[PDB]
């Protein structure tokens, strides 16, 4: 066999085996951005009631579900290596798991420029000066030249503090400083 390039995330499952085998063929020949723009439009053209039907319907055949898809991917835009991918998903019966392969590929291609975003879950949204200060100290923490994305969630069960995660780091300044008052009891 030949060797294959390793993705920087390395997820597992029956959907990770198809997002890795495409990443080992599109990192070769330098086509990692052409497939991504194609894959974000094949997600749109599957979820139509003419086409979402008779792909999960088990009583058609294997071969005529290929021919109804071998011309659909040929006429509109595509003749890359990715036309073999839809041809291979329909042979193995794995055409149902096609949103699983696409959604895995975006995060596998995200990490080529992405940052595994944060989670600040404290309270109601605050003023602008508090937001820009955390966005300009977390930029000092990545040290990788990548413009970090972030999400904010509202959870009032934390009393007055906030929890912050950077990837897989998870600092903590929250109501667990009230649970640290067992030193008055357990001593």
């Amino acid at each position: 066999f030949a060797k294959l390039v390793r993705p920087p995330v390395q997820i597992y499952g029956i959907e990770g085996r198809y997002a890795t085998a495409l990443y080992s063929a599109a990192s070769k020949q330098n086509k990692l951005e052409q497939v991504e723009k194609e894959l974000l439009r094949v997600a749109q053209i599957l979820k139509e009631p003419k086409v979402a039907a008779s792909i999960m319907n088990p009583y058609v055949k294997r071969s005529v579900k290929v021919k109804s898809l071998s011309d659909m991917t040929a006429k509109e835009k595509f003749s890359p290596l990715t036309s073999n991918l839809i041809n291979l998903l329909a042979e193995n019966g794995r055409l149902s798991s096609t949103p699983g392969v696409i959604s895995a590929f975006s995060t596998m291609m995200s990490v080529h420029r992405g940052e595994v975003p944060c989670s600040v879950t404290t309270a109601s949204p605050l003023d602008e000066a508090t937001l820009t200060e955390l966005k300009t100290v977390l930029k000092s923490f990545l040290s990788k030249g990548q413009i970090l994305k972030l999400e904010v969630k509202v959870d009032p069960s934390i009393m007055g503090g906030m929890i912050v995660r950077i990837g897989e780091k998870y600092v903590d300044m929250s109501a667990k400083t009230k649970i640290q008052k067992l030193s008055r009891a357990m001593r």
Binding site: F1, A2, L4, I14, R17, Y18, T20, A21, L22, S24, A25, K28, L81, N84, L85, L88, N92
Partner: protein, 501 residues
């Protein structure tokens, strides 16, 4: 549901264009290896039970065809194989070299020499997975196959085409019956009557390698390696090489049977084959049964011992005799394997481990040894005398100062000591019929029991010399007439007057 060939090294061949410089019709790769079988991807024109060849030089059998892969049973060790190899398709069912030009060699189970005498020089190849002959071509046995042992040839007679078991515990004299059968054929293979010639095959399964080597000397010492083949898969060989050892051994005997010759094969032993088929079954995750055996152990030994048959006169007239060996654990003749083979073969020979300790050798249990179809095919000279000894060995067995008890307890011990025999001394047929004559006609009833092994070695050594031309009419005419037994009365009663007590 994850698929064997859903791995990324095979999806990449498909997702990067359907590649042209891979064959995928006569050659394939190896995906995994280590439990015996290998998972070969490709090879889309392979047959079932077709021998393939690895890149290391190992043969392998195509056992199990699937829509993704092929499962190849590997002959020999599986250290030499690596994931990512390339396996070639031979194009033929598993077959072995066979012919007249093998008499005198020591091969392994695949048909390669391991005696260091160069190639074999064969021209024909027969398969190992052929079927037995049907109901029409067979016929009942009629020619006798001599053994040279005084306990076997007169109490459980064998015939050319009859299966016969040899069953006993360890170190009871199992192999030393099978060796004296091969040395006894020296008198027939070196003669002019071609209709009585008989070849031999020995199959050694799971034995030690240093016990086969001390066996081929003993055959060469007695001029018995010029009509004998030996197949050998010893205890250090892999498990598929012990499973396919009796099939390649029987396919070399099927050549002589279909071409008018008579053969003989000794499997030694079929116990260590069934513990080798157990290993390949449980390593394929099959449901075990009694004693953790697979469900088709009966198919293993029936499809092998059904080939040993005798063809009719319109098919050539040859034969094939088998003599398998089963080892029991402490006299257990009610276990799973020694009952699957009693219900196949046409009789038994029992070797007791508690008569081998008392000094009776060969320790043949005369009560439990039977031979059904081979009783009608024996010499009328032997049937005229051994039909009487069958009666007295029965009357000795019920009585185990009274009247009608101390008469049979006297004769019944002189016939037990008459049936002892030294190692590697195969007697002829017509020399047996004089020694069994003196023990059943009532001549040695007066002697002491300890001085009767001395008596047989003195009477035979002289009548072979001074009455040699008068003994040949027993073997030539094949019977004891009214002139021979009146002549035989004077030979013994003149020798007892000269035999110093």
């Amino acid at each position: 549901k994850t698929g064997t060939a859903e791995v990324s090294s095979i999806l990449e061949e498909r997702i990067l264009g359907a590649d042209t410089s891979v064959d995928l019709e006569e050659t394939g790769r190896v995906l995994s290896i280590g439990d015996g079988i290998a998972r070969v991807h490709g090879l889309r024109n392979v047959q079932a039970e077709e021998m393939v060849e690895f890149s290391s030089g190992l043969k392998g059998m195509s056992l199990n065809l699937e829509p993704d892969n092929v499962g190849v049973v590997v002959f020999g060790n599986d250290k030499l194989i690596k994931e990512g190899d390339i396996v070639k398709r031979t194009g033929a069912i598993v077959d072995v070299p066979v012919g007249e030009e093998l008499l005198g060699r020591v091969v392994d189970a695949l048909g390669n020499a391991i005696d260091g005498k160069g190639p074999i020089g064969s021209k024909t190849r027969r398969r190992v997975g052929l079927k037995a002959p049907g109901i029409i071509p067979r016929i009942s046995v009629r020619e006798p196959m001599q053994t040279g042992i005084k306990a076997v040839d007169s109490l459980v007679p064998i015939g050319r085409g009859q299966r016969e078991l040899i069953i006993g515990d360890r170190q009871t004299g199992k192999t030393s019956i099978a060796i004296d059968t091969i040395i006894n054929q020296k008198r027939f293979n070196d003669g002019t009557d071609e209709k009585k010639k008989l070849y031999c095959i020995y199959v050694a399964i799971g034995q030690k390698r240093s016990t086969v080597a001390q066996l081929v000397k003993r055959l060469t010492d007695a001029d018995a390696m010029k009509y004998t083949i030996v197949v050998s898969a010893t205890a250090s060989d892999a498990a598929p090489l012990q499973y396919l050892a009796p099939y390649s051994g029987c396919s070399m005997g099927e050549y002589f049977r279909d071409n008018g010759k008579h053969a003989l094969i000794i499997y030694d032993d079929l116990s260590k084959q069934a513990v080798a088929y157990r290993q390949m079954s449980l390593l394929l995750r099959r449901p075990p049964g009694r004693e953790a055996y697979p469900g088709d152990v009966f198919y293993l030994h029936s499809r092998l011992l059904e080939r040993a048959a005798k063809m009719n006169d319109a098919f050539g007239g040859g034969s094939l005799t088998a003599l398998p060996v089963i080892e029991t654990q402490a006299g257990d003749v009610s276990a799973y394997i020694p009952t699957n083979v009693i219900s196949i073969t046409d009789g038994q020979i029992f070797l007791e481990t508690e008569l081998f300790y008392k000094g009776i050798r060969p320790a043949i249990n005369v009560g439990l040894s039977v031979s059904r179809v081979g009783s009608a095919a024996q010499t009328r000279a032997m049937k005229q005398v051994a039909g009487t000894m069958k009666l007295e060995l029965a009357q000795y067995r019920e009585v185990a100062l009274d009247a009608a008890t101390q008469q049979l307890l006297s004769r019944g011990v002189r016939l037990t000591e008459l049936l002892k025999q030294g190692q590697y001394a195969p007697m002829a047929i017509e020399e047996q019929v004089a020694v069994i004559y003196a023990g059943v006609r009532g001549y040695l009833d007066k002697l002491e029991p300890s001085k009767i092994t001395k008596f047989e070695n003195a009477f035979l050594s002289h009548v072979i010399s001074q009455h040699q031309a008068l003994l040949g009419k027993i073997r030539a005419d094949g019977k004891i007439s009214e002139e021979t037994d009146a002549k035989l009365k004077e030979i013994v009663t003149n020798f007892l007057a000269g035999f110093e007590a």
